[PDB]
Ligand binder design. Sequence first.
Ligand code: 4T6
Length: 284
Amino acid sequence: EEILEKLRSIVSVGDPKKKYTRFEKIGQGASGTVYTAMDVATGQEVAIKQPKKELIINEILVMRENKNPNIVNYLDSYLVELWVVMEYLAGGSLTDVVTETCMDEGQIAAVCRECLQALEFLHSNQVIHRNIKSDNILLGMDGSVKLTDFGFCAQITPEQSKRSTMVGTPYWMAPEVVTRKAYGPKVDIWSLGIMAIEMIEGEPPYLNENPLRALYLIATNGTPELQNPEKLSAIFRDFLNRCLEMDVEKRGSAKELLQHQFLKIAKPLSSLTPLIAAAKEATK
Ligand SMILES: Clc1c(CNc2nccc(Nc3cc(C4CC4)[nH]n3)n2)ccc2nc[nH]c12
């Protein structure tokens, strides 16, 4: 495998054990393993991560060229199950917030705006994230909202502006991805729409179903229905319909959704810190 040497090509030099100190484990059995540490010279607290190595190559390459305030920025990488340094967001994932707390429209609008700012940046740089879900939204202790997980990323171009592979997580996948049709950046808009449903209902639609049954239900049902749409303002219902539109041409882009009236009721990001406190208490 010559893909191991293309990985080794631009990922160093230097010993990470001397640049950063006070390594504290926070990682799980997903791979693993994630640790916090502190920059010796500046005092910055950092997040350090420790089958398919090409997803790691793609992660690094896409991350270091697409730096943005709404993306969990890549800082550095080192030697050797590899050592990837990135910014630390102590508030944890949006998943704990959506499953343990009730979010108001002001707080939802604030999270949607921050995620849409990241998406308009990625789409303008021809990057389709393809794995938008609350699990890949990290929260700062100050209410910062940042996008992570660039492994399943697709770099488009005018020559080949479409993909047709089944990539992402079933419950958040656009019907055009599910049905293996030619798709583009607007698949991330659908996934954000599904993430706004998580913020309302606690779960994406069909979570109680098996991933294949959900895949079938997305293909046959199309636009998902809320359990209680009457609970939402007409402006929020309109924002959701524009995210979850079956017709790709009718579905909003990130640039045009950033102009939606729903985002005008967005609360300051500080309005998210009680949600983080509640989610930490609920999962403690
Ligand atoms: Cl690794 C990872 C975690 C690790 N666990 C964790 N717990 C509490 C806080 C916190 N903050 C982080 C993490 C990161 C950089 C991505 C490593 N910066 N700040 N991370 C969680 C959700 C993920 N969703 C995708 N990857 C995720």
